[PDB]
Amino acid sequence: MNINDNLSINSPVDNKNVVVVRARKTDTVFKAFKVAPNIWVAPERYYGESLSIDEEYKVDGGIYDSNFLSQDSEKDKFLQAIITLLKRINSTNAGEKLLSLISTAIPFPYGYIGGGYYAPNMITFGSAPKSNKKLNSLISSTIPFPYAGYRETNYLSSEDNKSFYASNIVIFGPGANIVENNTVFYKKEDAENGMGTMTEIWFQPFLTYKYDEFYIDPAIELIKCLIKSLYFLYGIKPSDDLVIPYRLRSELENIEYSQLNIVDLLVSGGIDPKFINTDPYWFTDNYFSNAKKVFEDHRNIYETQIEGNNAIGNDIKLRLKQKFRININDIWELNLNYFSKEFSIMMPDRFNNALKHFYRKQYYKIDYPENYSINGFVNGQINVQLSLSDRNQDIINKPEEIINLLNNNVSLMRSNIYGDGLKSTVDDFYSNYKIPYNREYHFNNNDSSLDNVNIGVIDNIPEIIDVNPYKENCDKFSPVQKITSTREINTNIPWPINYLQAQNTNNEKFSLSSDFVEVVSSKDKSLVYSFLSNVMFYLDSIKDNSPIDTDKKYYLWLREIFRNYSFDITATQEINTDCGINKVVTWFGKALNILNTSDSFVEEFQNLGPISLINKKENLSMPIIEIYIPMLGLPLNDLNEKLFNIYLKNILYFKKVYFNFLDQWWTEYYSQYFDLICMAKQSILAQEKLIKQIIQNKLQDLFKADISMDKLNLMNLATEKTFIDLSNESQIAINNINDFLNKSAICVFDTNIYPKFISFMEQCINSVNSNVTAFIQNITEDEKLQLIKLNTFMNIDFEFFDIQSIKDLITSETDLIKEEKESDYNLFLFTLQEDKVIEDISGKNTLVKYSDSISLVYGVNGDALYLKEPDESVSFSNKAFENGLTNSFSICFWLRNLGEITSKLIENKADNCGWEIYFENNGLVFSIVDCNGNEENIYLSDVISKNWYYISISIDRLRNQLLIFINDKLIANQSIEQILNIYSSNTISLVNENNPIYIEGLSILNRSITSEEVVNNYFSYLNNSYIRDISGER
């Protein structure tokens, strides 16, 4: 599949790739462009929606603008962006297979005008002229009278309604809502009855939001829309009343459950679809069986009637052949979790269709020659430079609950609980669902959905030139208007969202204090709530001090503030529960007013259960269990087989009930903890923004002082670096919060739901045992006792629990990608003598410049840099090496010196500021100098020629310690508390001067290390199944 890119908004209408077609059967016409076979792009807003809508409806997440995609420049930008996104999808193999399947899954055509697909009529045409035999009227040609007599529904009709162009997918701009990607069918009846119908997509590529620490690739959103459209193209769309429970709305006061259509769950991807699609089907519906039956019927219709018809063109026949070569179970198992792993795209995974309730979005503008390309985000998802859009002030904020804290009657604050925008249901779904006894009516999968898709065979299918249209292929478009209600819940004890909002502010004159009541009741609005104790303590300990004037004074403060933000936002306590080992985040209690009574959040969490954090406790509801032994007259063989079959069936039923209770835990209990994770995440981000603003205010105050311009520029660089350091220490806090609350949720399942499920199923086990006993009580002659003993269930019979299984249940592809792309080393040198290959694995892509004079030999455990030629240097360039005021790092390498002073081994130095390790006397010396004169010199002696030395140097600015390890022993434990900013160049140089040396495994880490890690690394590297001499040579 080749995406045609030679298109523009000014391209002439050739009626072959650029067309003007009527919108359904309305009076509107629109321009469409063909970018792929049966795939069109329409660079304009959707016709059906009203570009101007009443402010009453205006759904939440409501960026609304009637002047978007109006000018031709914006239209051409949209078309180019969509072409770029399609090329990005088509680049890999999974995306190419998906696009080929979309391009070949034409909706099933209707038969001839009389019904049926078997064969058309015959016409006798072209009678030969008369001759001596004469009357050659019968000697003529035979013709299929209706050729390609089938009637297609996937077609766009020109404005004059005399031309038709085949079309499976057309991509439009957004409707009324600017940021809302949607997929709409052409005919509702044909999207559910197995015929299949074309799809229209509303996609906005210019905006995206940020989740955690990454941006959402629009390619994944377009892929999700295409996967959803694959349902319509196959006519397997379920009814609109097939909603499954999605989230218990704990923010409410009445028990209500959010609901989600099954297509959204199947195609969204994440942990939610894997909590529903289980190994036995705890949730089953007639939809899966009906869809499978209809799909098999249509496949049989094709194989018996269409396949074999010689009066139908290959453009439809071959495309239908490839359409039915894919089993329907493959489409159900096709989710975003497959393409995210096949594309290395990080996306939200838990409750990803309800994120409107959790956090408020902030959108970013994306232009598409620069910010996004065929390879995706430029400079990666994490590090792509994007600018916040100007539409962030145009977002519609329609809440679902305006919490109004009251003093003693005035409103202290007001807040908003925005809704997920999902269909509600007051009736409890979990207490009205009967688990089926008699049972593949579901997905049951993975990574194998598109094996039957043949890219070459599909691409070799000639395009559909002429279309025999079906006059009733579209019906109408009905916009779904819906008003958003509210509920002014009035409380006296502040909700967690009141605590969350108390920390946000707009007036940049912070006076942060640890008193929520004082913050909310203050009139000047100069108070901001914060839980960072040492930050507040240190700031309140320097009130009576002279102002910061010299850049030294600055640096020292910016050091004290970052070395307090860390010991405040990265504080955990190891509380040993009767359920596991837990690290409890100490400030979590005073961040959201959860167990905030007394003066210890750890104590209450270590006294009450891990469920006391959440409010909607005890939400379990046992389903309507059935538990269906049907006369006697069997020998000791048939009876045993029947008993074994009933045993297996009952075990399966018990597993299904257990999976139902797992879903009950996930929907109603983990949602509480996920919401708590989101609120804690927002709290750290807020309290980061607070420090950032505090230091920026100091800088600005220092700028208007008697400081040299060069010193001020150095100050600014150090502050820009310490901001990234603060971001790192907050990300560490985020990880701590996530781990702690996930462990709490897992334990709550293992200590508050599993015993309840066991107690509930004890009665079912007793009933099953009684039924088996009654049935067993054509002869046995006391063997009936043995049979009844062999087929009686016990408490252990239905123990499905495994903490590893549930811990891996809540792990998604995003977590795996984050683990695979989170290195603890800035630089990790790799050498391989195969062609001499020198590279870096750390992922920062350090630029390595090495002369050809260097070679490669086997030093200790692999290829080692051998600097035989004198005056040969190797340099490594990376931004992170520039260092700063507050960042810890470490250098680890293996050195072998052949020469027998002052050889300048390695140095990252700029005039004075920097660090260096250089030969002197008979050993290496480590020198570290700042931009203020202060320096530290360490002489690590006893480094003789040859041998093999392992040097590990660690600088930690959090504790202000310099640890020097040689081989596996501590050589120095000095203090660097007198060393300020050491900002140096972005390059690290390795120079041999005139000293042939071997350098092996040189590595620069982004954090400090410990003696245990050094010893472990040394001994694990030295063990390579090789005998060594007294020096180290093998």
Automatic annotation (TrEMBL):
Keyword Hydrolase annotated: yes
All residue ranges annotated as the Botulinum/Tetanus toxin catalytic chain domain in the record: 2-326
Keyword Flavoprotein found: no
Keyword line: Hydrolase, Neurotoxin, Plasmid, Toxin, Virulence
This protein's GO CC annotations: extracellular region
Entry-linked Gene3D superfamilies: 2.60.120.200, 2.80.10.50, Clostridium botulinum neurotoxin b, 'coiled-coil' domain, Metalloproteases ('zincins'), catalytic domain like
GO biological process annotation, one example: proteolysis
EC numbers, comma separated: 3.4.24.69
Cited InterPro entries: Bot/tetX_LC, Clostridium_toxin_transloc, ConA-like_dom_sf, NTNH, NTNH_C, NTNH_H, Toxin_rcpt-bd_N
Non-toxic nonhaemagglutinin helical domain span: 502-771
Family: Belongs to the botulism non-toxic nonhemagglutinin family.
Protein name: Botulinum neurotoxin type B1, nontoxic-nonhemagglutinin component, NTNH
Gene from which the chain derives: ntnH
